[PDB]
Ligand binder design. Sequence first.
Ligand SMILES: [Fe+3]
Ligand SMILES: [Fe+3]
Ligand SMILES: [Fe+3]
Ligand SMILES: [Fe+3]
Lengths: 307, 307, 307, 307
Amino acid sequence: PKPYVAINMAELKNEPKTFEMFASVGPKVCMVTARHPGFVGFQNHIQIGILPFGNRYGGAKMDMTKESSTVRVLQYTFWKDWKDHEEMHRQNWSYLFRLCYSCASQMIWGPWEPIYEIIYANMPINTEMTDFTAVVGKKFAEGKPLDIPVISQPYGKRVVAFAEHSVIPGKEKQFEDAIVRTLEMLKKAPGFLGAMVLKEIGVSGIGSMQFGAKGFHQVLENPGSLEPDPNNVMYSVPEAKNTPQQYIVHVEWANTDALMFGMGRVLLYPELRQVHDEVLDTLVYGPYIRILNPMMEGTFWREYLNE
Amino acid sequence: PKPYVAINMAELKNEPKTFEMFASVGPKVCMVTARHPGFVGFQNHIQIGILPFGNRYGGAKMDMTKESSTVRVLQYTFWKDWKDHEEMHRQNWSYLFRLCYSCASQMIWGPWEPIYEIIYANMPINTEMTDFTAVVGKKFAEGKPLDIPVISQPYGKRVVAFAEHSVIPGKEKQFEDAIVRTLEMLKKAPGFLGAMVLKEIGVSGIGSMQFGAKGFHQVLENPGSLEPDPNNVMYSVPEAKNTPQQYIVHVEWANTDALMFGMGRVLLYPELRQVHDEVLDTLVYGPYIRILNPMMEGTFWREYLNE
Amino acid sequence: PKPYVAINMAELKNEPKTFEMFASVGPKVCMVTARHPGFVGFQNHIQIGILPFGNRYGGAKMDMTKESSTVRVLQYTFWKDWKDHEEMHRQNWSYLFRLCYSCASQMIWGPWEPIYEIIYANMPINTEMTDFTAVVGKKFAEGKPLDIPVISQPYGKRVVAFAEHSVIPGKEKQFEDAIVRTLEMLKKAPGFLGAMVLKEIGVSGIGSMQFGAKGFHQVLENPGSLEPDPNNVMYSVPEAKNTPQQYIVHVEWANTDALMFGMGRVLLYPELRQVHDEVLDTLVYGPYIRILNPMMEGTFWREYLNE
Amino acid sequence: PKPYVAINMAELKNEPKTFEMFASVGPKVCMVTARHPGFVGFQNHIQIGILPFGNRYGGAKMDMTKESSTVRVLQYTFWKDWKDHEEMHRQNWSYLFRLCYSCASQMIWGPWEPIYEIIYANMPINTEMTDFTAVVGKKFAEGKPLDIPVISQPYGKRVVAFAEHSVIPGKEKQFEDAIVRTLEMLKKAPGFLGAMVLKEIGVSGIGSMQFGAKGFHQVLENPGSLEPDPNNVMYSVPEAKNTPQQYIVHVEWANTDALMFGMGRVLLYPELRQVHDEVLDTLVYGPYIRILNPMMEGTFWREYLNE
Ligand SMILES: [Fe+3]
Ligand SMILES: [Fe+3]
Ligand SMILES: [Fe+3]
Ligand SMILES: [Fe+3]
């Protein structure tokens, strides 16, 4: 079934020490998150660049990693029910806060953790290049050759277009209808590895370290080994939902060229351009497209998805 | 009277070519904006850093200019009526678009131009250190020594704390009441040069280059000398107003030390801390504090303000 | 169905500034071209070298990119009707001229834009290495395993042999019959990714910036933002068709070795050599074979082709 | 059928001279070992690193080859009957001792050669990337598409997780039952190339150069060309079997990322974590996971296995 998605976003210094801590602390946080039975997996990204759209963002390029002073992370965790995410944070707060806090020395902005519902998904299981023979054999054995997926390689071996949109109030239905039509056509592009549309339902105050006054002082004053009061979060997830309504259009690609020209198909192929124009007409903000590397992930989230 | 404020926000490459552009094109844009009789002035900032709040943002510091790969700009323009801003953009579109487009090669994100109403202002006219003798003389001559302001030096000779907040729906009144009480007490801190609270009323689609499909294609396809259709903006300013409600608390300081310890007075002076706690209890997001240098400005906006 | 092909040809300085231009302005031109409903896609090439034919062109090699002072581009655009190309240029002239002019500082020769009909095509859809599993699955599911194509990777991941020929007047039929027989045999060579034969039908004056006196002066005098009179083209497409008749034999290969020995099969395999000799007997000029890299492309042109 | 496994373990200096003698002497030893008809193949590994488990072993990493002063080898030989291994050593003692002894100048610890029974195996034949087409063709021809394996590339083109465990006396059955359930679920992880569980049955004294007094002196005094008395081994294989019972859980993976996250599936996927917890409850020691490169191998051992 479709899980809910929490996306933890932060910006940190782009230096070895940051990546070292990703390596020590990242796995620990994931292991703690997996204590909750509603956790169905995760997909953690580093932003490697920004789509320049010709020279609309002429200062950007798809891979800015060598020049950038910062690194942005977008950590997706997948949940049977979004409430599971909220419960997991609270039940495991002692561990999670202390692990999370340890990132402090490297932090510039964040964390900020909106929660999303998936309103459309066409996402395959991941497979390594070694797996495809057995996958093919099994699907033919089952008489289901249509269920043979593209090869979407895990652990940093493909790229993601993370396309931010906000929509004019009243035009949400038009946006949703048009974007699905667009993605249904986009799947013809070479190197297309899947797409999903995430619709924001709220924000996790606890995941964003956004407390009332009491918790704020506890965070600022923390030596690293004392929890802020997790009950001092002043708002529920839905209370923080944005209007204009925000969406992420998440599309995966074999490589950055396939991403650039593939995403470009909505601009270059007249038939698809006419359809995508209906999306553009609904926007307050966007599309702004971040190029992401899905480096660390729990690929079994797609197994839950495709049940 | 209180003007409305448009704040054009963008992120560009941090290199000499960007600053050279600022120098050529910036004055031109400012001169075009001044064609409209509702324009009452401007104050343009570059972000120099981020308040680390101890080590809450341990990777940040108040001056990151030597290390940062990007530069963020926040260009305030002040208007008798916010509709004047919208009219100015449309009446001068051929000049403004072509001037603003020229920044393309350096752009990473933006432009994004929210519009604000000022709900509280305690902001003096600017004066250079050469001016104070005459100011004092004139105020005593008029029998108004209470109207002698602090010396708030123009053109990059002071600093700004730009404090972002978003508020839980239903708590806007509590936020506004408490933040005013806070700023009324904060003005006792050494080196305090004034404060104002900006409340978002919407976003200028035209100023943010956010059009429907037609204009989007015109922007992407532009050689630099052809206007997108300014009538292709699909939303009015108020239609883009965010909920949760966004505010900027803008506070000016003699220098970054006065800023750090002065803003810190809300955390360190028990009496003020109790008051500021009432602000904290209302937040969905923030406070996140950007440190800005007001480099280029039309100081007469404060003359309009203090009429 | 078979589209018509316009091929815009130019020679430019081989330096970073040229490639930077390609990156900014290229996408813009492609997006403008896609405004016309007769546009079915594009395939843009840089020449990387020349086939030396042993030492017939002993000064050449298949990859001369490191040593060459110039770069030649051959930009294919595909059209339902060749008249669509002509209409598109005129309907979008203000954008296209200003975009294309911007390449001026780098130009040495061109542009020159002949138009071709496709008289033979055996060209597959492009696929990335990630796609083949799903392609295979779908073709078997449909009971069409014969329709499984070779893997022709898009975006610079294969090479093109661009073979120029001109034919003795009266021998066009002999050339066309023989070249088709040749290509039907050539498809047996390892790494063969497809072939088509293009027959010139004329030249686009407007695409070649070839005007009467009025437009010539407008071009030479242009500051970059004023269109030459697009009605000042003095000849129709067919009026410029060359005699001796010109053809391009366009053959795609997995890599430059497969190209060299594959194209070489017409010289080394006695059975095929005898057939290809019939082609050779008809020539005024050629074969001269340019080695091209198809870097930027709208792969959906092959979807139109293979309908 | 399932062969028995002897694993010869040693630690040597990490320098070119060591690898040079691997190259000269290794093939010779294998050729001698292959004189015995019970020999069914071999798989020789170098340890490249250690799984850090987050920062549990924070000084380790999966590839420590550039920094390590030593190299550990784990040489698996496979036998129809473990007694065949013992007979082979004795029948070929003059060759084997003199060959093995030549490694002396590089040795730091070892050799030590435990013997194992295989209690669970899910291990495919190896294939190179060139082989898969014919394997697929043959399996479909035989009507056995289920028997198409993953591509497990030989000769250092995949990696091994070598997971050491010792079990609380009395909990062997619980361990064995739970580990099999774990591995049956683990096979779903991307890049999984197979797994087996080895249960120690004893230690080869002769393979470990562990003699009584007489042989010990002969080893220490050896010029290199005189055999110690092979009849001076004072214990039989089973007499050296350890309690707590030792197991190796041997799991093969496409690459070190697939290994890290795949092995990690037992910690990150709640369903599998619950199962693997039953393994963890039985342990005296472990899991300690060595990362191995299977460099030199006789792949036909898997042909014997899968008969
Ligand atoms: Fe979270
Ligand atoms: Fe504006
Ligand atoms: Fe053209
Ligand atoms: Fe042995």
